[PDB]
Amino acid sequence: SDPALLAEIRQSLDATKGLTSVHVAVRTTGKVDSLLGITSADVDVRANPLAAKGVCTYNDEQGVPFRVQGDNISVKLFDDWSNLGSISELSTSRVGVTQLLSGVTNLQAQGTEVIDGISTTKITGTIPASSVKMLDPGAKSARPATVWIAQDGSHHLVRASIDLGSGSIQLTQSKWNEPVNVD
Ligand SMILES: CC/C=C/C/C=C/C/C=C/C/C=C/C/C=C/C/C=C/CCC(=O)O
Numbered sequence: 001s002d003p004a005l006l007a008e009i010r011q012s013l014d015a016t017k018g019l020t021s022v023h024v025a026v027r028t029t030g031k032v033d034s035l036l037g038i039t040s041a042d043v044d045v046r047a048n049p050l051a052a053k054g055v056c057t058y059n060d061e062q063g064v065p066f067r068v069q070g071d072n073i074s075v076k077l078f079d080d081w082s083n084l085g086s087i088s089e090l091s092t093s094r095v096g097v098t099q100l101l102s103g104v105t106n107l108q109a110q111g112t113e114v115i116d117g118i119s120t121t122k123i124t125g126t127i128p129a130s131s132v133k134m135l136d137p138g139a140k141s142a143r144p145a146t147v148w149i150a151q152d153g154s155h156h157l158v159r160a161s162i163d164l165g166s167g168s169i170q171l172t173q174s175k176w177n178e179p180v181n182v183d
C-alpha cells in the first residue's frame with residue numbers, strides 16, 4: 001500500500017474512467033470459468049451508453065461474434081444470438097473500476113516493460129479475496145495481480161492481469177478514443 005504506487009495506479013484508473021472508447025483484448029491461461037464461458041475476446045467498447053461489439057472464444061468455439069447491447073451480454077452461434085448474461089444481474093450478483101484499492105497490498109514497482117511499442121511501468125500487488133470474487137465468484141484467497149501503466153503522459157492502463165488459482169486473466173487496452181461502431 002505504498003502511497004506513491006497507489007497514486008500511479010489511480011492515475012491509470014482515472015484515465016480509464018475518462019475514455020470515450022477503447023479496444024479490449026482479453027486472454028486467459030489455464031482454466032477460467034468466471035467469464036460466462038468466454039476464454040478470449042477482442043472487443044470494441046463505447047463507454048456511454050455502455051456498448052460493445054467484437055469477437056470471442058466461447059466454449060472453445062473461436063470467432064464467435066460478441067456484443068453488449070443495453071443490459072444484455074450476447075454471443076452468436078450459427079445464425080442465432082443468445083444471451084450469456086445481464087449487466088444489471090452481474091452487477092448485483094458479484095458486486096466503478098475503483099475497487100477498494102485500499103485492500104490492495106504489497107504493491108511493488110517491477111520496472112519498465114514495453115507492450116505493443118509502449119513503455120509501461122509494471123506494478124504488482126495482491127488483491128483481497130473480496131475483490132477477486134467480483135471477477136471470480138469462487139475465489140477463496142487473496143490473489144496476485146499486475147498492472148502496466150503507460151509512461152507517455154497518458155497513464156493508459158495498457159494491461160492488467162490476475163493470477164487466479166486455476167488460471168489467469170489478462171486484459172490489454174488499445175485504440176483509446178478511436179471511434180467504434182457498436183450498433
Ligand atoms: C495491481 C493492482 C490492481 C488494481 C486493480 C486494477 C483494476 C483493473 C480494471 C480493468 C480495466 C477496465 C476494463 C476495460 C474497459 C474500459 C471501459 C471504460 C468504462 C469504465 C468506466 C467506469 O469505470 O465507470
Ligand SMILES: CC/C=C/C/C=C\C/C=C\CCCCCCCC(=O)O
Nearest residue numbers: 026035038041050087090091134135
Ligand atoms: C469479455 C468477457 C465478459 C464477461 C464479463 C462477466 C464478469 C464481469 C465482471 C464484473 C461485471 C461488472 C458489471 C458492470 C457494472 C455496470 C456497468 C454499467 O452499467 O455501466
Ligand SMILES: CC/C=C\C/C=C/C/C=C/CCCCCCCC(=O)O
Nearest residue numbers: 024052068145160161162169170171
Ligand atoms: C486485475 C484484473 C485483470 C483482469 C481484467 C478483467 C477481465 C475481464 C472482465 C472485464 C470486462 C472487460 C470489458 C469487456 C466489455 C465490457 C462489457 C462487459 O462484458 O461487461
Ligand SMILES: O=C([O-])CC(=O)C(=O)O
Nearest residue numbers: 053054055065066067076
Ligand atoms: O455483432 C457482431 O459482432 C456480429 C454481427 O453479426 C456482425 O455485424 O458481424
Ligand SMILES: [Zn+2]
Nearest residue numbers: 002003004005
Ligand atoms: Zn514508495
Ligand SMILES: [Zn+2]
Nearest residue numbers: 024025042043
Ligand atoms: Zn483486438
Ligand SMILES: [Zn+2]
Nearest residue numbers: 023043044175
Ligand atoms: Zn477494435
Ligand SMILES: [Zn+2]
Nearest residue numbers: 077078079080
Ligand atoms: Zn439457427
Ligand SMILES: [Zn+2]
Nearest residue numbers: 034136137138
Ligand atoms: Zn470460478
Ligand SMILES: [Zn+2]
Nearest residue numbers: 154156176177
Ligand atoms: Zn488517451
